[PDB]
Design an enzyme around this catalytic site. Sequence first.
Site, PDB file in Angstrom:
ATOM      1  N   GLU A   1      -5.929  -7.677  -0.959  1.00 37.73           N
ATOM      2  CA  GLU A   1      -6.387  -7.628   0.544  1.00 37.73           C
ATOM      3  C   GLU A   1      -7.732  -7.176   0.320  1.00 37.73           C
ATOM      4  OE1 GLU A   1      -4.724  -5.549   3.620  1.00 37.73           O
ATOM      5  OE2 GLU A   1      -2.562  -5.922   3.106  1.00 37.73           O
TER       6      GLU A   1
ATOM      7  N   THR B   1      -3.704   1.405  -2.568  1.00 35.69           N
ATOM      8  CA  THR B   1      -5.384   1.339  -2.103  1.00 35.69           C
ATOM      9  C   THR B   1      -5.932   2.618  -2.171  1.00 35.69           C
ATOM     10  OG1 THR B   1      -6.266   0.670   0.094  1.00 35.69           O
ATOM     11  CG2 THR B   1      -4.381   2.129   0.280  1.00 35.69           C
TER      12      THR B   1
ATOM     13  N   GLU C   1       0.764  -1.243  -0.108  1.00 34.62           N
ATOM     14  CA  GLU C   1      -0.078  -0.101  -0.026  1.00 34.62           C
ATOM     15  C   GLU C   1       0.984   1.241  -0.143  1.00 34.62           C
ATOM     16  OE1 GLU C   1      -2.811  -0.226   3.221  1.00 34.62           O
ATOM     17  OE2 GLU C   1      -4.035  -1.556   1.997  1.00 34.62           O
TER      18      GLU C   1
ATOM     19  N   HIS D   1     -13.701   1.604   0.626  1.00 37.85           N
ATOM     20  CA  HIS D   1     -13.185   1.715  -0.722  1.00 37.85           C
ATOM     21  C   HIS D   1     -14.227   1.889  -1.793  1.00 37.85           C
ATOM     22  CE1 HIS D   1      -9.132   0.172   1.092  1.00 37.85           C
ATOM     23  NE2 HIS D   1      -9.353   1.392   1.535  1.00 37.85           N
TER      24      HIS D   1
END
EC number: 3.2.1.-
Length: 386
Positions: A253, A194, A155, A228
């Site tokens: 992930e 991310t 990330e 997200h």
Amino acid sequence: GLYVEKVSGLRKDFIKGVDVSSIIALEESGVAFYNESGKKQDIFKTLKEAGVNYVRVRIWNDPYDANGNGYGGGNNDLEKAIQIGKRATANGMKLLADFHYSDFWADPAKQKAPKAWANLNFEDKKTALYQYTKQSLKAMKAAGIDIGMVQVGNETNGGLAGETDWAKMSQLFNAGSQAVRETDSNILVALHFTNPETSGRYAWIAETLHRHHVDYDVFASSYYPFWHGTLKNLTSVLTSVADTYGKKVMVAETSYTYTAEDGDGHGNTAPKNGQTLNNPVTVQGQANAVRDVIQAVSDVGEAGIGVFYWEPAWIPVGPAHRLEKNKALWETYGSGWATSYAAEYDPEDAGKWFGGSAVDNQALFDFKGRPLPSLHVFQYVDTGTP
Ligand SMILES: OC[C@H]1O[C@@H](O[C@@H]2[C@H](O)[C@@H](O)[C@H](O)O[C@@H]2CO)[C@H](O)[C@@H](O)[C@H]1O
Ligand SMILES: [Ca+2]
């Protein structure tokens, strides 16, 4: 009982992974896992029978203080990565080595240089990063581990090993990539970012990586439905990267809550007020969530190669009411997300919130190590539930 709708268009060689980095610290804390029948069994065997074909493991350079006291979070160093890799390989699952290139958690806010690289000029740090990756990989090969992929950073939205300038970050990405390439040309090189929901983010990152000649194969993204964005967006931003730069894409992930209960006494990451919860907080909702992200990645087309569930077995070392006795285990075996001993490295975060598991309620096993029915989502995505 459980229902799983077949994922349309799912390729047969789709990567079905799990990151169970906390497993060693947990077993040392006395935690045990079981199979369907209810008899103690190596979790890696249970994962294999559930249809998992890949294991991801995080690796910190030196996750300990001067005296050797673990920072916690599983105390994941190269030594444990080898233990995990051997068991993954022994159970017919490929390995994804995830180098954080930090002595502790690396994420959007934390990308601290390992203690050993703190006083190195950029050039020497790059050499060190390259060297570390190279030696770590060789050690894993010597152990007979089947390495299918390597993540160069974790990330790295705004930094890597103490660096925040993208020109320097790219050289570090390349230094790491170098070592992988020199180790085995078949190993896929992945970069991990991310917050896919941020407008234009992934597009900007992919273009920047391109301008800096960064040599990588997979553009990986984290995907936690809580913050997200939509699955539609995820597919869209990953598809644009794939199409535009000819890269494979995947979710490194992902996870979901099967219960609102906190099993070990240490407040959990989810569910929480404000977070988006499109699925019920149940075993069925968790399964729908996993099945859906698999669908979303699969929808990318030929470029969508897989999905890794993050920490499906970070269960409690003890009941919530035994909080104080739990702290003893967390502090001694680092089976919690962080120990007080990490305060020296990360005083701002780990320093004051160190403790147990923050994701015991997003595991695919119950608080006692019994596999939940949602564990079989990995199998049912291919055929669907009868
Ligand atoms: O007390 C919970 C604790 O969790 C921390 O999150 C850590 C780590 O820092 C993250 O990078 C990782 O994704 O998740 C682990 C826990 O699962 C968080 O940074 C702290 O502020 C606390 O919320
Ligand atoms: Ca907890």
